[PDB]
Design a protein around this ligand. Sequence first.
Ligand SMILES: NC(=O)c1ccc[n+]([C@@H]2O[C@H](COP(=O)([O-])OP(=O)(O)OC[C@H]3O[C@@H](n4cnc5c(N)ncnc54)[C@H](O)[C@@H]3O)[C@@H](O)[C@H]2O)c1
Ligand SMILES: NC(=O)c1ccc[n+]([C@@H]2O[C@H](COP(=O)([O-])OP(=O)(O)OC[C@H]3O[C@@H](n4cnc5c(N)ncnc54)[C@H](O)[C@@H]3O)[C@@H](O)[C@H]2O)c1
Ligand SMILES: C[C@@H]1O[C@H](OP(=O)(O)OP(=O)(O)OC[C@H]2O[C@@H](n3cnc4c(=O)[nH]c(N)nc43)[C@H](O)[C@@H]2O)[C@@H](O)[C@H](O)[C@@H]1O
Ligand SMILES: C[C@@H]1O[C@H](OP(=O)(O)OP(=O)(O)OC[C@H]2O[C@@H](n3cnc4c(=O)[nH]c(N)nc43)[C@H](O)[C@@H]2O)[C@@H](O)[C@H](O)[C@@H]1O
Lengths: 315, 319
Amino acid sequence: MRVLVTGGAGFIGSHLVDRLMEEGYKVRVLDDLSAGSLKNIEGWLGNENFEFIKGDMRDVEIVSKAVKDVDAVFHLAANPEVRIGSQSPELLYETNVLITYNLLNAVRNSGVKYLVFTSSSTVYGDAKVIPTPEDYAPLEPISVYGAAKLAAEALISGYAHTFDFRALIIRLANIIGKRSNHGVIYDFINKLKANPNELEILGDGTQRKSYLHISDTIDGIMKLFEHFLNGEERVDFYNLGNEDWITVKEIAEIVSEEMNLNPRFKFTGGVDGGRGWKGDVKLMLLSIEKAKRTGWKPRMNSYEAVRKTVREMLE
Amino acid sequence: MRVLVTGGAGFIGSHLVDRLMEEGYKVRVLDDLSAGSLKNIEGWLGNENFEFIKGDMRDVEIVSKAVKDVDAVFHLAANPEVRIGSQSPELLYETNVLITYNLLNAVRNSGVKYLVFTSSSTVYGDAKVIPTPEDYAPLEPISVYGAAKLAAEALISGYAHTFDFRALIIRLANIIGKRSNHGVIYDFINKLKANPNELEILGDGTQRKSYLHISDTIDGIMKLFEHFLNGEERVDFYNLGNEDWITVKEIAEIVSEEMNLNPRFKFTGGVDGGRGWKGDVKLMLLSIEKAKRTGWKPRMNSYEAVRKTVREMLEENIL
Ligand SMILES: NC(=O)c1ccc[n+]([C@@H]2O[C@H](COP(=O)([O-])OP(=O)(O)OC[C@H]3O[C@@H](n4cnc5c(N)ncnc54)[C@H](O)[C@@H]3O)[C@@H](O)[C@H]2O)c1
Ligand SMILES: NC(=O)c1ccc[n+]([C@@H]2O[C@H](COP(=O)([O-])OP(=O)(O)OC[C@H]3O[C@@H](n4cnc5c(N)ncnc54)[C@H](O)[C@@H]3O)[C@@H](O)[C@H]2O)c1
Ligand SMILES: C[C@@H]1O[C@H](OP(=O)(O)OP(=O)(O)OC[C@H]2O[C@@H](n3cnc4c(=O)[nH]c(N)nc43)[C@H](O)[C@@H]2O)[C@@H](O)[C@H](O)[C@@H]1O
Ligand SMILES: C[C@@H]1O[C@H](OP(=O)(O)OP(=O)(O)OC[C@H]2O[C@@H](n3cnc4c(=O)[nH]c(N)nc43)[C@H](O)[C@@H]2O)[C@@H](O)[C@H](O)[C@@H]1O
């Protein structure tokens, strides 16, 4: 089986590439390195089962070529920066709706049999049912990013039914670990690297969300993928997150602890009710009963995930 | 109130334009006449309260210009042909996702306060709960058209929250009536005008869906709009359909009755289990409890709606 991994030179994408290569798949990565890096996958360059394609998925010919001789696609290429939605929604539209559409047009007339998509908890919006289940509705995303992720999901479903392939949609919580160049942990580490006396924390520090270490995330994506392949569902929806959640204040405390620092916390107060930025969901915790029915469970909770992530990053 | 109506020269759009003009709104229509027609709105041309812009919403400059000095937008512009999804999905993507994205970027830099959007029951896909309520999930559209409608909804919600305007999303069932140049009734009438002894029926004839006459639909869109303006919600979701449903076979029988014909029925058998085409939902019936709590109710049921539409279209054809 050949599997294409868009965004495979990124954080989640590079870890999933590691896993796919170790399990013996033929892996083709398509990445424009706008955010990713060859350092994330240099261990695999030159492997007789590995191909790298430096390309922007806006380029429709590149995408058509990438899906050639591919039996499965893992579509992780995206701009995952919620914060930019208020200032640059077109960027999010291009990196979440447009290139997904391009992928689907290419997949349409191809031998691609399976399409796996890393969606986001942000599709649930400010969810009123917590833990949020896969069947929560109406879906009312509050950010351009979450809206774009939901749009991608919808297109994937329609194309899967119209053009006879199968789609696995996995709505991930906040995923953290080594190689990430986005997110609160990364920014706190750099902030304290620049000034260890004072740390600016966006919002009111109470934003509370479920964090999943990348190890558990790849394990989950793979067990879900396997179970999906063995089923008949044309399109299936799974949450992937942790059992618990944790606040931004506590994350700041862990980041400080691990760096043997003692900054003053300076909260900005945020916007729209203590949010870090327009569209920042304040409370997120996904239900993972459906995924647990595959034999998957987080080996770490959110606190352990955060602490391991900080230590990994510092090395 | 100044309102822009995209797709206002089309089927639903022109009737909504009529209603807005009669109520004294200042109406601006944006339509590229790809499906619509000047004849649908010619009664209003030259009225000091009516402006028409023949423009393609693919052009972002046209749309930016269109939303200027507008307090509300009714976004009805789209290509509504589910059937084409298998052969030209790109067209659907452009006329349901892309132009909606452009509209939202234009609204972002504008004084528009309200956005009303005609979404579709197809966003529910082959729903397992019938009557289907607004909070049914997971949403799993089976057509490129339904997927595009759902994507548009999602973008509308995200933009509404990020950029602080209010959005009313109305998921319509099958809407029928005068001025329609799409749908099973139009096609059956044309089929029998070309050969009145034989009617080809796509699928197995058991496709069963809820039909709403356009009169009831405009009344409903207006009651929802009014209540929404008076409400608090940032984004709201309403189904708009009938209480009942009806099969394609019965629609063919009504069409035949009204045409004083009795043709041989030729079912194609369809695909994916009797569907008319890839993505054709087989069973659709929306719950309208939420809409009913605004004081709205269909004045016609699906059978009556279909019969009124057949008679309307036939008198239209004579004229
Ligand atoms: N990290 C999280 O917490 C999280 C949570 C939920 C969902 N996701 C989703 O998981 C996927 C990966 O996220 P990540 O954290 O690894 O992000 P990342 O930025 O580290 O990786 C994404 C990759 O996409 C590539 N890319 C971006 N635009 C591209 C384009 N136009 N053409 C080709 N390649 C392009 C980038 O270069 C990068 O390698 C995305 O779909 C993201 O939305 C991530
Ligand atoms: N008729 C139904 O049963 C039904 C049901 C549910 C939802 N809807 C929705 O209601 C709306 C109107 O449907 P309708 O039956 O009146 O269709 P229609 O084709 O009669 O009207 C749509 C209008 O959009 C215009 N248009 C298309 N592409 C355009 C573009 N790029 N720029 C500008 N204008 C463009 C067409 O010229 C036409 O005038 C659509 O959003 C449709 O999806 C219709
Ligand atoms: C579901 C996933 O949600 C994830 O969003 P998202 O909660 O912002 O993920 P983070 O960017 O890690 O932010 C987590 C929380 O920390 C707050 N925060 C406080 N200070 C900072 C800071 O300096 N930087 C950052 N980045 N956050 C900060 C942030 O507003 C939010 O409440 C996405 O990364 C994924 O793509 C996906 O959408
Ligand atoms: C919810 C609404 O659903 C509506 O879809 P949709 O049921 O296909 O609406 P129609 O195109 O009217 O098709 C209604 C039913 O009639 C069947 N049918 C049988 N023979 C024919 C034929 O010759 N022509 C046509 N056209 N249909 C035919 C068709 O497959 C479907 O089962 C959309 O038009 C709206 O935009 C909206 O999405």
